[PDB]
């Protein structure tokens, strides 16, 4: 139960054997044996009696018979002993009187292996036994049955619909037809950017500063010289020479606090976004406010690309991430959720060192190259849209037609600008992104592109079909010998005619 | 529902009257396990039943009707805590089908 | 000194034993090189002595490794595999009621007084009762042993009276039950193991084969899916609905008992089918048992039939060899095959097929040494007189529906 | 450490007598029709404790008193007696019975009461509430006496399947029931109650084969008697009426063999020498 | 000597005093009648050895014979018998907490095992080693001394073991606290052993009806299934399709939950049908509703219908008695015997009828004593006026897919 069991067999070997040969090598050696043949034989059966792991054709046998298939079907013994064609293979044994070394050509061959009905590697005699017990174990239901050929084929992994494991059972309904949880993305100098069908609004007043005044450097000690915004000549993402340098002058603990319309709402997700460049520092805090003093801190490193400073005065931070653009810039999303309404303001200022807050103190003076903020309501960044003293509301695009799957936008897709798609239509899922439509400049309408896979309903009562193989690259004796009825590995309910066939 | 007394010993084994049968129950200290020899009116009924918490003694049906009961471990059996700790519970037909029926639906 | 592991053919571990020369190689090269491992000798003992415990051990373990799969287990050991399926191993009882007594006036029917039947019935009463002064009172009875016993419907003989009581008279007023004995199986639940293989499942043939198995007195239950439904017929059995389960089940079951599992197994929407007229007897004929969903609401309808009986002979001519005296152990041995007492080999059942050389060899393996000549069959319907020896062929159809059955007294042995 | 134990069953609870007061039991138990006997010697009783025990056993309120329907007409005393060392008891059963016999036996300073008991002492029962079975077999005699005063029952005998034409109606009360199962088929087969289980079973044969119990440790020596052997030893409380024995001895090796019990005589004294039993054992077939 | 330990009653080991006390015999008898077997001698010492052996194996037997019992089966034989059915016993891990904000001073470094703790116990290691930079606060990575999903708020982490220079730790909101897990234990194996086999041992309809009723505010459930192949009523739902389940959800619960609990009892093969018009409101649209799989994304609809929705009314005409009564207590009682909050007494349940016997037993039941003179009850369609005096009836058969609701303002009671 608890207190030890020893059991050794060496036990008796008192102290007067310590340097005797014969007893003590007798004793060794009966250990050695009993070790042998009783340990080492349980280990291996406990192993053999293991189903994931029966790798011991005996055990796929043992087992066959505790489930109660016929054994014709099942190719075990060691292979490499038919001849067929190939040098990987036997070849013809001949009367070699002499006993050749070599064998003659080949010792032996034979034609154990027949096609179109027997299997022969073992994994998947495995697989048909553990499929067998789910057979009798089974009641019927399509969630169980799919759960366990997943559990299976795939140890419990998902899949990609670019493979396709295995499908349905006898349950003649098919989801879809029509489209729901449409989900739009746009992909440009944003990078994978997703648009809205209800009107999306962006509360800054500005986005793009080219003028001090635009917006105010606030600064609580004011030792130093208010941050600055400068009219910067770089690169920008959209593709002018229009960023905003911000710097911060030494022993200055000054931040900018963009103009926004307040309050944003209470209890309501926010979203801030903007595009940053590395500039004389390598990161970048911003700060999302509440009430005093409930706001949130985040510090991006625009090179790294790592969140490593997440700071929660209160229950406010959600998340934080960053996107990659070309010409090594960055957006960095903060999102956050609080439940007061005092949400005035988000402050923004260049990081000295890694965890710089808004009001950290400067040794020198750094300057960061910023462009496009965005500050919204919901959980997710959207495309970039100017703002130049208002709180921009826009609306991206409106489904005029939800069977053909044509969408209408408010302004023409720019030359170039790709268009994904994520949801459900014609019966056919699309859980990744996929490309519909390119912009000509000109154009507004675009119709959708076929998801996946298959119409899916397969018309009829009382019976349905499987479907596998293009994911799982199984072999076709796998096929025939599971589309065999005779055998009953498939899970059946009784009067429901199921083929397995299918690639 | 009758607790069966005890002792706090590796090797032991009890005969009693319970149920309108005589039964007797050798339990013994087997490695890191508990085994119990049943036998019922002398002749015997099994032999190295592994004892377990809730976990019927008696597990085959044939052992069990017509109402002749069953032994039931509060907890995984232990020598060292019987007595003070781990009881086991003898169940008479009625009780042990009731027993049955609540354990079948968990 | 080696454990073969017959992979696929006999799914057996066997022990080679041959650990002498093992033995004597570790007493050599540890003990010594050059010793005299002769017998006689004390050394030779010792060896002799150890290599007899290794041969134990590895026998003993091979059992052991072995009883994981059936048709090589025994009690409390295939017992693990079945309660693995939860095949379960099936209880003691016994149980009869509801019998009348013909008797004089005002007698103290004592309890346990005791009756019998023809066939060894041995009935006692259940509790004390005093007849009324009428001439006739309604007593309980038991069966004295565990097997499964059908005493005929008419009044027979008393074992235990008072001078007084005339006679327990058997009506259709009376009831009966199953009992099973242990694992009746012995090696029968080899046979039955693999047809309750899916207890567990529920809404297939094989769940529904081994649940409605699993009811007391079905010695066999033949179940067609009929899946293919375009009416024809399919595998036997011809097909009213296109789309209907059929369902044969032999014994003599409660019709509330077996109903609530067929219908506890309903494999969803399928419907029964069981006319085609001569196809198997209908239980209820129209409109069968009503029986009531667990799930309350409605009150279906369950439709299942009853096979055909038939009467079996077996002319078997032996030649008694080898100086071995067997008068009437023949008819024994080819009972018992027919009730399926033997061991893999299923006897008549509701699917089954009366052939010649089954019996022959049924009579082989109960009996070797008396050189089976000849083993005609035929049959007959469930009356009918003696098919005459013309009949007498080696084999019978028996199509899937019917069932066949062999009396003691319709074997008979021609001795040359 | 002996342990001995003295309770009592009375309105008020249980009331054990523990070994601290000077305690002497005498039980002597057979397989006869006889009820076996205990006399039991309490002293150091207090006065109340006299009150309460002395004033409810009488002979009484069934003789010139009605105030009787069921139990609680006298009192049901059994004795549980064993060893304890390590903190391990070993508190076994050894007597079950009704007072029937009050006493004292030495006056002051050391009042001591000396009390007789009989098993099923009850014999002024419902005079026999079921009537016994016309014709019927012996086993079946056997399970109506045994219904009738509410002990179960070992039946283990060879006679059990014989008819018996008209099987004592004669009888009075609930203990005579014994006295005629013993009275009938009396060579070998004697019926007897232990404790509250009524035994009928063949005299050279075990109630319970597995059961046996080695003994190899005696008082004195096994001997040899006109049965079987004869020996004494130390309280073992695993030695029962009727149980098998296998006794291996020493000093006479002649003895050896496997027996089975036909009479116990437990003298059990907490603040005395006598700690014994004595068993009479005859050959075991 | 080791006579048959294994016999047929499972395995039978005796103590090692017997089987010591066997080898020491057979000893005996081999090499001399008087040899000394002392466990210092080497025959002493080849007998003990062979009693630890011999021994050893009669425990492991004995402990691994009854192996295939998953009811009483332990570890890992446990863990792959329950792997069949998909039950996996878990893997203990434990918290990893990473990023962890470290403050201190100048370049203090922190070394492995630096053993930090939150302010509720749940004492964490460093797993490696930091120095902090010129800023002060560096990043750390902690993982849990113990197994499971240990709670790791963000809030001030104390440290038990410091070096000199650290400050403290933070759990700031970019820590990804990873939780762990605790494994699982065999008994709460078999449990969800047992749970699976509950699942998989119903038919199609009582499946559904568990399911659905283990989703909350669904106050009843009604469920009907064809099996006919013959587009009918069956008893009182009209049904559309041959081979179909139509089942009605009552209360006001949630649709996708309802849906999954629906998709996961599906009996599959047999389809849902909305039935014809006015069987139960087909909410959701012609088209069932979508769910998806939690097994695959594959995809599949399903259909279920809400009963048609009543008014009931009552009038009563009781006489207060003695003790003073208010009509608000009987209009309190009867709304409460409706919605089903009394004992015993289902209440207006899925396709039950409307009886003022029933209502008057409630009545009388709450509150005994009143005299009840006449009781009418009627039902009429939602939203619907009040049926007019004499329009009631003394009793209202209802059909098998609605329920009604008698509110406060739906009984007129009157005092004569």
Redesign the interface.
Same mark, same amino acid.
């Given at each position: 139960t608890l207190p030890a069991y020893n059991s050794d067999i060496q036990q008796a070997l008192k102290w007067l054997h310590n340097q005797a040969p014969g007893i003590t090598g007798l004793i060794q050696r009966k250990a050695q044996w009993y070790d042998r043949f009783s340990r080492q034989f349980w280990a291996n059966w406990e192993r053999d009696v293991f189903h994931l792991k029966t790798a011991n054709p005996f055990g796929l046998m043992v087992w066959c018979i505790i489930l109660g298939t016929p054994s014709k079907g099942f190719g075990l013994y060691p292979k490499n002993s038919s001849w067929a064609f190939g040098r990987l293979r036997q070849n013809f044994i001949y009367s070699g009187t002499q006993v050749p070394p070599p064998a003659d050509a080949s010792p032996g061959g034979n034609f154990y292996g027949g096609g179109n009905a027997e299997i022969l590697n073992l994994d998947e005699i495995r697989k048909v036994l553990q499929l067998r017990y789910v057979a009798l174990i089974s009641n019927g239901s399509i969630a169980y049955i799919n759960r366990m050929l997943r559990y299976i084929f795939n140890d419990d992994e998902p899949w990609d619909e670019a493979t396709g494991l295995y499908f349905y059972l006898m349950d003649s309904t098919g989801e879809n037809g029509p489209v729901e949880n449409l989900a739009i993305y746009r992909k440009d100098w944003e990078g994978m950017v997703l648009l809205s069908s209800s009107p999306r609004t962006n509360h800054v007043l500005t986005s793009t500063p080219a003028s001090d005044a635009d917006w105010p450097g606030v600064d609580p000690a004011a030792s130093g010289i208010p941050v600055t915004v400068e009219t910067a000549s770089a690169t920008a993402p959209d593709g002018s020479a229009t960023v905003c340098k911000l710097t911060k002058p030494a022993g200055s603990t000054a931040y900018v606090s963009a103009p926004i319309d307040g309050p944003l709402g209470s209890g309501s997700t926010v979203t801030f976004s903007f595009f940053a460049k590395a500039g004389s520092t390598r990161f970048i805090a911003i700060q999302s406010a509440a009430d005093f003093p409930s706001r949130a801190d985040a510090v991006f490193d625009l090179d790294s690309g790592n969140v490593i400073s997440d700071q929660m005065l209160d229950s406010s931070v959600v998340s934080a991430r960053m996107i990659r653009l070309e010409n090594g810039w960055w957006r960095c999303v903060l999102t956050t959720k609080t439940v007061s309404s005092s949400f005035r303001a988000a402050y923004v200022a260049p990081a000295e060192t890694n965890f710089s807050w808004i009001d950290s103190n400067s040794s020198a003076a750094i300057d960061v190259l910023i462009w496009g903020a965005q500050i919204e309501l919901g959980d997710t960044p959207t495309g970039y849209l100017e703002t130049t003293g208002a709180p921009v509301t826009m609306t991206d695009y409106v489904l005029q037609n939800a069977q053909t799957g044509t969408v209408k936008f408010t302004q023409p897709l720019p030359t170039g600008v790709e268009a994904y798609w994520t949801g459900d239509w014609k019966g056919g899922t699309a859980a990744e992104p996929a490309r519909f439509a390119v912009g000509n400049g000109t154009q507004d309408t675009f119709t959708l592109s076929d998801p996946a896979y298959i119409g899916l309903p397969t018309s009829g009562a009382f019976k349905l079909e499987y479907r596998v193989g293009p994911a799982l690259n199984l072999s076709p004796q796998l096929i025939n010998l599971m589309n065999d009825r005779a055998v009953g590995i498939m899970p059946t309910c009784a009067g429901c005619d199921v083929k397995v066939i299918q690639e | 529902m009758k607790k069966i007394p005890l002792t706090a010993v590796p090797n032991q084994a009890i005969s009693f009257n319970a149920g309108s049968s005589y039964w007797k129950i050798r339990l013994y200290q087997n490695m890191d396990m508990m085994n119990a020899d049943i036998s019922r009116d002398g002749v015997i009924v099994c032999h190295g039943v592994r004892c377990f918490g809730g976990i019927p003694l008696l597990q085959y049906s044939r052992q069990y009707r017509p109402d002749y009961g069953n032994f039931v471990f509060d907890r995984d059996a232990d020598w060292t805590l019987f007595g003070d700790g781990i009881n086991l519970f003898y169940l008479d037909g009625a009780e042990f089908a009731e027993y049955q029926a609540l354990a079948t639906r968990k | 000194a080696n454990?073969n592991?017959?992979?696929?053919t006999g799914?057996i571990v066997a022990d080679t034993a041959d650990v002498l020369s &093992?033995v004597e190689a570790?007493?050599r090269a540890?003990?010594?090189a050059n010793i005299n491992l002769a017998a006689s000798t004390?050394q030779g003992?010792?060896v002799?002595?150890?290599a007899i415990?290794?041969s134990?051990?590895?026998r003993?373990?091979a059992?052991?490794?072995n009883? +994981?799969?059936?048709?090589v287990s025994?009690?409390?050991?295939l &017992?693990? +595999?079945c309660?693995?399926?939860?095949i379960?191993?099936?209880?003691?009882?016994?149980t009869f009621g509801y019998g009348v007594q013909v008797t004089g006036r005002s007698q103290?029917r004592?309890?346990?007084?005791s009756r019998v039947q023809t066939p060894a019935g041995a009935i006692f009463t259940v509790l004390?009762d005093v007849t009324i002064p009428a001439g006739g009172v309604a007593t309980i009875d038991i069966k004295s042993q565990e097997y499964g016993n059908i005493p005929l419907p008419v009044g027979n003989l008393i074992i +235990?009276?008072?001078?007084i009581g005339w006679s327990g008279a058997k009506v259709i007023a009376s009831t009966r039950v199953d009992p099973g004995s242990?694992?009746m199986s012995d090696a029968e639940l080899k046979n039955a193991r693999?047809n309750r293989?899916?207890i567990?499942?529920?809404?297939?043939?094989?769940? +529904?084969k081994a649940y409605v198995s699993a009811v007391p007195n079905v010695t066999s239950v033949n179940?067609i899916?009929?899946?293919?439904g375009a009416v024809q017929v399919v595998n036997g059995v011809s097909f009213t609905?296109?789309?209907?389960?059929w369902v044969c089940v032999a014994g003599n079951p409660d019709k509330q008992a077996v109903a609530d599992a067929l219908?506890?197994?309903?494999?969803?929407?399928?419907?029964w089918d069981y006319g085609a007229t001569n196809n198997g007897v209908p239980v209820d004929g129209p409109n069968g048992v009503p029986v009531r969903?667990?799930?309350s609401?409605?009150?279906?309808v369950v439709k299942w039939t009853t096979p055909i009986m038939y009467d079996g002979y077996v002319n078997v001519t032996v030649q008694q060899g080898s100086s071995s005296v067997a008068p009437e152990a023949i008819q024994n041995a080819v009972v018992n095959y027919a009730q399926g007492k033997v061991e893999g080999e299923e006897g008549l059942v509701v699917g089954a097929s009366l052939s010649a050389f089954e019996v022959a060899g049924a009579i082989a393996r109960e009996i070797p040494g008396i050189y089976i000549k000849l083993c005609q069959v035929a049959c007959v319907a469930a009356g009918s007189p003696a098919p005459a020896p013309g009949d007498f062929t080696s084999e019978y159809v028996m199509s899937a529906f019917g069932q066949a059955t062999i009396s003691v007294g319709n074997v008979r042995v021609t001795f040359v | 450490k002996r342990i001995l134990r003295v309770t009592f069953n009375m309105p008020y609870g249980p009331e054990v007598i523990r070994e601290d007061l000077d305690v002497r039991v005498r039980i002597m138990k057979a397989a006869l029709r006889i009820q076996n006997r205990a006399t039991m010697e309490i002293f150091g009783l207090t006065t109340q404790l006299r009150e309460s025990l002395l004033s409810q056993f009488t002979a009484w309120k069934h003789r010139q008193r009605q105030v009787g329907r069921e139990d609680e007409l006298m009192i049901k005393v059994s004795v549980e007696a064993g060893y304890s060392d390590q903190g391990r008891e070993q508190v076994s059963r050894v007597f079950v019975g009704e007072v029937a016999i009050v006493d004292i036996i030495s006056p002051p300073p050391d009042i001591g009461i000396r009390i007789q008991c009989y098993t099923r002492q009850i014999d002024r029962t419902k005079t026999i509430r079921n009537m016994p079975p016309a014709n019927t077999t012996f086993v079946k005699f056997v399970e109506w006496g045994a219904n009738e005063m509410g002990l179960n029952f070992i039946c283990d005998t060879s006679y059990n399947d014989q008819v018996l034409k008209n099987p004592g109606r004669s009888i009075t009360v609930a203990s005579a029931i014994l006295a005629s199962i013993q009275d009938m088929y009396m060579p070998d087969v004697a019926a007897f109650v232990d404790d509250d289980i009524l035994i009928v079973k063949d005299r050279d044969k075990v109630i319970r084969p597995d059961e046996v119990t080695n003994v190899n440790s005696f008082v004195g020596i096994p001997s040899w008697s006109e049965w079987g052997v004869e020996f004494q030893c130390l309280f073992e409380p695993s030695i029962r009426v009727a149980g098998g024995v296998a006794v291996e001895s020493l000093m006479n090796p002649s003895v050896n063999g496997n027996y089975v019990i036909t009479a116990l005589e437990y003298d059990l004294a907490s603040r005395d020498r006598p700690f014994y039993i004595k068993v009479m054992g005859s050959p075991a077939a």
């Amino acid at each position: 139960t608890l207190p030890a069991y020893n059991s050794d067999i060496q036990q008796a070997l008192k102290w007067l054997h310590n340097q005797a040969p014969g007893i003590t090598g007798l004793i060794q050696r009966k250990a050695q044996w009993y070790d042998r043949f009783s340990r080492q034989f349980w280990a291996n059966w406990e192993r053999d009696v293991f189903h994931l792991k029966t790798a011991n054709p005996f055990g796929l046998m043992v087992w066959c018979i505790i489930l109660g298939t016929p054994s014709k079907g099942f190719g075990l013994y060691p292979k490499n002993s038919s001849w067929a064609f190939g040098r990987l293979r036997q070849n013809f044994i001949y009367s070699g009187t002499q006993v050749p070394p070599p064998a003659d050509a080949s010792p032996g061959g034979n034609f154990y292996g027949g096609g179109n009905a027997e299997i022969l590697n073992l994994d998947e005699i495995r697989k048909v036994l553990q499929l067998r017990y789910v057979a009798l174990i089974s009641n019927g239901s399509i969630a169980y049955i799919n759960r366990m050929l997943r559990y299976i084929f795939n140890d419990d992994e998902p899949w990609d619909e670019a493979t396709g494991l295995y499908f349905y059972l006898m349950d003649s309904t098919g989801e879809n037809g029509p489209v729901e949880n449409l989900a739009i993305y746009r992909k440009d100098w944003e990078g994978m950017v997703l648009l809205s069908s209800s009107p999306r609004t962006n509360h800054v007043l500005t986005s793009t500063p080219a003028s001090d005044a635009d917006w105010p450097g606030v600064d609580p000690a004011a030792s130093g010289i208010p941050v600055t915004v400068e009219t910067a000549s770089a690169t920008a993402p959209d593709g002018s020479a229009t960023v905003c340098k911000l710097t911060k002058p030494a022993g200055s603990t000054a931040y900018v606090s963009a103009p926004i319309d307040g309050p944003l709402g209470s209890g309501s997700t926010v979203t801030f976004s903007f595009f940053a460049k590395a500039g004389s520092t390598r990161f970048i805090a911003i700060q999302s406010a509440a009430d005093f003093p409930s706001r949130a801190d985040a510090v991006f490193d625009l090179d790294s690309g790592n969140v490593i400073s997440d700071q929660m005065l209160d229950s406010s931070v959600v998340s934080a991430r960053m996107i990659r653009l070309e010409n090594g810039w960055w957006r960095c999303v903060l999102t956050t959720k609080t439940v007061s309404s005092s949400f005035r303001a988000a402050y923004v200022a260049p990081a000295e060192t890694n965890f710089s807050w808004i009001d950290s103190n400067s040794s020198a003076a750094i300057d960061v190259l910023i462009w496009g903020a965005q500050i919204e309501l919901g959980d997710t960044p959207t495309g970039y849209l100017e703002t130049t003293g208002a709180p921009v509301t826009m609306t991206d695009y409106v489904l005029q037609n939800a069977q053909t799957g044509t969408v209408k936008f408010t302004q023409p897709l720019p030359t170039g600008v790709e268009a994904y798609w994520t949801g459900d239509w014609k019966g056919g899922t699309a859980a990744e992104p996929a490309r519909f439509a390119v912009g000509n400049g000109t154009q507004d309408t675009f119709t959708l592109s076929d998801p996946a896979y298959i119409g899916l309903p397969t018309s009829g009562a009382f019976k349905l079909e499987y479907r596998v193989g293009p994911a799982l690259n199984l072999s076709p004796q796998l096929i025939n010998l599971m589309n065999d009825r005779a055998v009953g590995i498939m899970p059946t309910c009784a009067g429901c005619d199921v083929k397995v066939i299918q690639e | 529902m009758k607790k069966i007394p005890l002792t706090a010993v590796p090797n032991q084994a009890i005969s009693f009257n319970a149920g309108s049968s005589y039964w007797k129950i050798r339990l013994y200290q087997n490695m890191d396990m508990m085994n119990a020899d049943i036998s019922r009116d002398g002749v015997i009924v099994c032999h190295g039943v592994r004892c377990f918490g809730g976990i019927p003694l008696l597990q085959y049906s044939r052992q069990y009707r017509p109402d002749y009961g069953n032994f039931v471990f509060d907890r995984d059996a232990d020598w060292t805590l019987f007595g003070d700790g781990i009881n086991l519970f003898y169940l008479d037909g009625a009780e042990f089908a009731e027993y049955q029926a609540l354990a079948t639906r968990k | 000194a080696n454990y073969n592991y017959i992979v696929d053919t006999g799914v057996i571990v066997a022990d080679t034993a041959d650990v002498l020369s &093992d033995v004597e190689a570790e007493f050599r090269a540890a003990l010594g090189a050059n010793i005299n491992l002769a017998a006689s000798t004390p050394q030779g003992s010792l060896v002799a002595a150890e290599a007899i415990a290794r041969s134990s051990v590895m026998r003993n373990e091979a059992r052991i490794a072995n009883t +994981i799969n059936p048709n090589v287990s025994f009690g409390t050991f295939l &017992d693990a +595999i079945c309660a693995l399926m939860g095949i379960e191993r099936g209880s003691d009882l016994s149980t009869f009621g509801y019998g009348v007594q013909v008797t004089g006036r005002s007698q103290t029917r004592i309890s346990t007084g005791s009756r019998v039947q023809t066939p060894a019935g041995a009935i006692f009463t259940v509790l004390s009762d005093v007849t009324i002064p009428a001439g006739g009172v309604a007593t309980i009875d038991i069966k004295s042993q565990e097997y499964g016993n059908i005493p005929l419907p008419v009044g027979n003989l008393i074992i +235990i009276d008072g001078t007084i009581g005339w006679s327990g008279a058997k009506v259709i007023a009376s009831t009966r039950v199953d009992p099973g004995s242990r694992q009746m199986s012995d090696a029968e639940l080899k046979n039955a193991r693999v047809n309750r293989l899916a207890i567990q499942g529920r809404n297939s043939t094989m769940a +529904i084969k081994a649940y409605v198995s699993a009811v007391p007195n079905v010695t066999s239950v033949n179940v067609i899916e009929n899946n293919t439904g375009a009416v024809q017929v399919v595998n036997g059995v011809s097909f009213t609905l296109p789309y209907a389960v059929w369902v044969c089940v032999a014994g003599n079951p409660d019709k509330q008992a077996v109903a609530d599992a067929l219908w506890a197994a309903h494999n969803g929407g399928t419907p029964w089918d069981y006319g085609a007229t001569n196809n198997g007897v209908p239980v209820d004929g129209p409109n069968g048992v009503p029986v009531r969903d667990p799930a309350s609401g409605r009150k279906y309808v369950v439709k299942w039939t009853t096979p055909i009986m038939y009467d079996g002979y077996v002319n078997v001519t032996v030649q008694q060899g080898s100086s071995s005296v067997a008068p009437e152990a023949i008819q024994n041995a080819v009972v018992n095959y027919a009730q399926g007492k033997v061991e893999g080999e299923e006897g008549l059942v509701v699917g089954a097929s009366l052939s010649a050389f089954e019996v022959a060899g049924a009579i082989a393996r109960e009996i070797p040494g008396i050189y089976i000549k000849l083993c005609q069959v035929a049959c007959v319907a469930a009356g009918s007189p003696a098919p005459a020896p013309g009949d007498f062929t080696s084999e019978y159809v028996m199509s899937a529906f019917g069932q066949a059955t062999i009396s003691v007294g319709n074997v008979r042995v021609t001795f040359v | 450490k002996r342990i001995l134990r003295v309770t009592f069953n009375m309105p008020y609870g249980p009331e054990v007598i523990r070994e601290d007061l000077d305690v002497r039991v005498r039980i002597m138990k057979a397989a006869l029709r006889i009820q076996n006997r205990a006399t039991m010697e309490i002293f150091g009783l207090t006065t109340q404790l006299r009150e309460s025990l002395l004033s409810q056993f009488t002979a009484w309120k069934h003789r010139q008193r009605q105030v009787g329907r069921e139990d609680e007409l006298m009192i049901k005393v059994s004795v549980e007696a064993g060893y304890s060392d390590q903190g391990r008891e070993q508190v076994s059963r050894v007597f079950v019975g009704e007072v029937a016999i009050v006493d004292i036996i030495s006056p002051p300073p050391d009042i001591g009461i000396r009390i007789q008991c009989y098993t099923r002492q009850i014999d002024r029962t419902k005079t026999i509430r079921n009537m016994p079975p016309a014709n019927t077999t012996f086993v079946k005699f056997v399970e109506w006496g045994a219904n009738e005063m509410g002990l179960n029952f070992i039946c283990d005998t060879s006679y059990n399947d014989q008819v018996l034409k008209n099987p004592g109606r004669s009888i009075t009360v609930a203990s005579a029931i014994l006295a005629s199962i013993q009275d009938m088929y009396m060579p070998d087969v004697a019926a007897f109650v232990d404790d509250d289980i009524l035994i009928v079973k063949d005299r050279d044969k075990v109630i319970r084969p597995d059961e046996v119990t080695n003994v190899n440790s005696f008082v004195g020596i096994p001997s040899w008697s006109e049965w079987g052997v004869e020996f004494q030893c130390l309280f073992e409380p695993s030695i029962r009426v009727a149980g098998g024995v296998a006794v291996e001895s020493l000093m006479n090796p002649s003895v050896n063999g496997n027996y089975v019990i036909t009479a116990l005589e437990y003298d059990l004294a907490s603040r005395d020498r006598p700690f014994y039993i004595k068993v009479m054992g005859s050959p075991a077939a």
